[PDB]
């Protein structure tokens, strides 16, 4: 058991020192490695409970049983005397740079997961290359290093959400005694985009500075895995070449889908284009009903736009549907229009985009409702939010042997390994995993520690909390109510719930019984909390902390015995008492 | 053991039915009581661990072993047939109403704990009186039902905190694209107070409605305990009388102190006066350094007041002093002035308050610094926040025999019992307990269930999370860093920490390395989280959820294995890695 671990650690680690915290000979070796700017992992045998077994097992590689022992890419290099001999003979640099491959690690994709994996591997002396390329959108949009979240996802999305929330702050300000008049104030889209883009650009630069200071090679080129160890690259001059690496991490992400109707690609846009659009969208049609669709329609409406969402069937498929409808109801009461049970049939161009005067075009949209009645209306912008997908055929020659599932995602073991022993996958292309930025970062850093530092910790993908940043936010951790009932039966599930009103909403004369929270519990497992749900301001700040308690197996009794913080919205979770079976109203 | 619980429950309950869910003879008795509108507790024996043992023990009181059995104030009343005989004969009302005392429970004090205890007791059939009276401040300020939090504490102070937070929202809105000029907007104090006071009044009225619909007798009267079961009352006409109750709960709270110096009571005010002050305070001096003092100085400055705080020694005594100093540093850089190591000697009047034209007076404050140097400066308002204390000699005749401590607070067992067997104390006057509103509510609700419904659950007073609502908020759960070092030794403590910047602050050009958080951990106990600390926006919402995890014994690895919600401030707790021992900078 220990022997299998040691052999896997020695085989993949780039440079690794087996040591003890007391030993001065180990310290002497540490000092020479630092002075020569040699990065390496280190394992302190006296810190691990079975260090005695590991010490003995090292002899199977080195013929010796003492510390220090230093290895390079699977080969024993020597003890203290031998290492210093290589140092004072100027032989040591060539020893540690000896490799069958160009790099110890090649990362394909410079986004959330890939940057995280690459920076971490480099800390333990792995020679690392990170490749990133941004295929332009149909109208040409492109952006810098860092991936979807940084450039065209979480970061610009929540910044524009914040600009929307500030509209209600200006409203609420009058009731708390400030002299402004909200009705005389308007919003300038291009001023907002300029500010958002400036922050995004400082992240683009920050990541390039980070890869430089960690000694990671950054290639702005499109990568393609042609054999288990061979990556073909194409640069911005279409020059083609091949690089090799020992371990390969795939982290190339997804891009937005388009519906297969005439005029879509030509005359509409997606979220990839929206966050740097040089003109206000104007009257806008959003097609879709995912969180991306609803969040985008949500802040466009708060910024003052005329917005419609075209919904094929339901909102937020895959989320708790009672919560989903409350989310929708709030948007519809606050100026978002919905076209329900409706799908688009074609887009016609009435005006070309006025690139000079900086104005949108004009489009005619035709569709139909599920009963067959007709939809026809004009909009200035059409935004498609109908899902996202990878295109791994552009990354992965089928002959390499990497297995994919029905949806084109990569089938991995619980340690991110693909069907090819030296290739791994992380992030949105890892089949069946939650498609979220912090998941992709944790997977990437933990994998790098397993490959190059002998770590064993795995990424835990269960009960990861979410927040949908709609105008009233929706946070969750665990199972939806319908999922819990499906799995255990209605008789074994209890639901505690309550409305609430933020204290900030009192003086501002906002709604009495719109915000809502529930806990979904299992009767037979000591009232274990199966899922938590909250609709309200700052839902992500509210929810995050409870994710640790749910991770630890929290029950209703743990919620009850914890005392609230007053006055907060989140304290309502600590005093819940009305069950759904009781039929008592949850208003307050 | 079971015997003694059943004894305690029967002698204390007002009206209690021992039942089984399956039995139709019980259903028959429940319905008769519901129709006659008799409230009562119910113990379902088929839903308890040893319900079969209680069945046999019930015979000691009733000589029967069957179910249902009904008791009134310790006395067995009858089985199914006997209750129906009393009901058919019009004998039931007089049986359930007969008592040695006027009330089953008298609550002295209508505040956070008192109202919570009284409502809960009335649910289980206890005949309940709640007494509340608000002795005026020296300038005559007075308010309605609800206690300190509702009228002159948590609720008005956080509402005024929000009015101050909205000032930075107006500033931020320009950077996010809105067309307003913050420099041309001003605040109106009295418009704010009117909105605040109208909401407080909707809570005064709601409590009076809630007591009525629970059949609780509300007496706007000053109560005094003269004997174990005898409460003397004095109404608004100074008419005196005596009522008697079985159980007594003292819940009378505290009031603010004044320093023993000339002119203070005459010419200064306290928080009791601030929340309904009819004029803007003007140039203000706050004397003290508790959370009250800093919270008030904080929003006065944000509303555009000229504010100074005078500090004897340190800020926020009893809280983590690193956090405390970061709190004050933020205030000082955003326009609160501090006069450190300074105390007051006397207050002189220069102008009287102009009550007609609605203007403050003018005062001269004389004091000295800790070295010997002198303080002299004029202010329009002077607010004292130098602590709070009870005045139990008003409430409680020393001949009754209720033991107080050296501070004047009630010494209680862990179930809130005083030295007199039927008298209990809850809330701020309970010695050694955290003085917080959710604590008082839980103590009062749980005690009511032990008295009248046979509950056994106690209030847990440990690791209760707090939030200080200064201009930059500060939340905490558990031990300060210094307290952990002292209790366990510096070699057994590891502290993880990190600065952070909210995403919302990026586009609005706010500070980079001001918000800050840390986990105080015990090495020798699996890196248990001893205390959590966070300085930043929405700190109460952030902290609350982790209180549940800390209650359950969370460790650093529990925080590590939980995934973050992105983008939030709170997610920074899920990736902490820089330790203080390592000396690495926590900046970002
Ligand atoms: C509008 C929107 C909002 C979102 N909001 C949130 C949110 O609030 N919270 C959250 O947790 N998640 C959010 N997400 C999801 C989050 O962006 C993703 O889960 C995350 O970016 C996944 O990271 P990744 O490393 O898997 O891929 P990516 O971040 O997409 O990075 C992959 C990179 O590889 C590049 N690449 C592709 N093919 C090649 C190739 N052949 N050669 C070289 N480079 C290549 C891509 O151009 C890209 O730069 C949002 C997504 C969207 C679209
Ligand atoms: C400025 C300020 C801000 C605060 N902010 C917070 C906060 O954000 N969060 C928090 O958790 N806590 C806060 N607190 C503390 C919180 O208000 C108290 O812990 C809580 O009010 C205590 O409740 P209680 O039931 O013990 O007493 P109280 O709420 O004070 O109620 C006691 C009541 O009994 C009345 N009474 C007194 N003597 C008699 C008598 N003889 N007969 C009849 N009635 C009598 C009193 O007049 C009062 O109405 C704050 C306190 C202050 C002063
Ligand atoms: N259907 C369909 C067409 C389609 O989805 N395209 C839009 C995205 C473009 C890109 N971002 O690389 C090219 C491919
Ligand atoms: N209620 C009320 C307010 C009140 O009566 N005062 C409390 C402090 C007293 C003092 N320390 O000299 C002055 C009187």
Coordinates of N, CA, C and O and ligand atoms in Angstrom, one line a residue, chain B residues 134-139 255-261 265 272 389 391 394, ligand 4:
Chain B
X134 N -41.6 52.2 30.6 CA -40.4 52.8 30.2 C -40.2 54.1 31.0 O -40.8 55.1 30.7
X135 N -39.3 54.0 32.0 CA -38.9 55.1 32.8 C -38.2 56.1 31.9 O -37.3 55.8 31.1
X136 N -38.6 57.4 31.9 CA -38.0 58.4 31.0 C -36.5 58.7 31.3 O -36.0 58.6 32.4
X137 N -35.8 59.1 30.2 CA -34.5 59.6 30.3 C -34.5 61.0 31.0 O -35.6 61.5 31.2
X138 N -33.4 61.5 31.4 CA -33.4 62.8 32.1 C -34.0 64.0 31.3 O -34.6 64.9 32.0
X139 N -33.9 64.0 30.0 CA -34.6 65.0 29.3 C -36.0 64.6 29.0 O -36.8 65.4 28.3
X255 N -30.1 50.1 31.3 CA -30.2 51.5 30.8 C -28.7 52.1 30.8 O -27.9 51.6 31.5
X256 N -28.5 53.1 30.0 CA -27.1 53.7 29.9 C -26.7 54.4 31.2 O -27.4 55.0 31.9
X257 N -25.4 54.3 31.4 CA -24.7 55.0 32.5 C -24.3 56.4 32.1 O -24.2 56.8 30.9
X258 N -23.9 57.2 33.1 CA -23.4 58.5 32.9 C -22.1 58.7 33.8 O -22.1 58.2 34.9
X259 N -21.1 59.3 33.3 CA -19.9 59.5 34.1 C -20.2 60.5 35.2 O -21.0 61.4 35.0
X260 N -19.5 60.3 36.4 CA -19.8 61.1 37.5 C -19.0 62.5 37.4 O -18.0 62.7 38.1
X261 N -19.5 63.3 36.5 CA -18.9 64.6 36.3 C -19.9 65.7 36.1 O -21.1 65.5 35.7
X265 N -25.4 64.8 33.1 CA -26.8 64.4 33.1 C -27.6 65.6 32.6 O -28.6 65.5 31.8
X272 N -30.3 56.3 24.2 CA -31.8 56.4 24.5 C -32.4 57.6 23.8 O -33.6 57.5 23.3
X389 N -26.1 49.4 32.7 CA -26.2 48.6 33.9 C -27.6 48.4 34.3 O -28.4 49.3 33.9
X391 N -30.8 48.1 37.2 CA -31.1 48.8 38.5 C -32.1 48.0 39.3 O -33.2 48.4 39.5
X394 N -34.8 48.7 42.1 CA -36.1 49.2 41.7 C -37.1 48.0 41.5 O -38.2 48.1 41.9
Ligands
LIG4 N1 -34.0 56.5 33.4 C1 -33.1 57.2 33.5 C2 -31.9 58.1 33.5 C3 -31.5 58.4 34.9 O1 -32.4 58.6 35.8 N2 -30.1 58.6 35.2 C4 -29.1 57.5 35.2 C5 -27.6 58.0 35.5 C6 -27.6 58.8 36.7 C7 -26.2 59.2 37.1 N3 -25.1 58.3 37.0 O2 -25.9 60.3 37.7 C8 -28.4 60.1 36.5 C9 -29.9 59.6 36.3

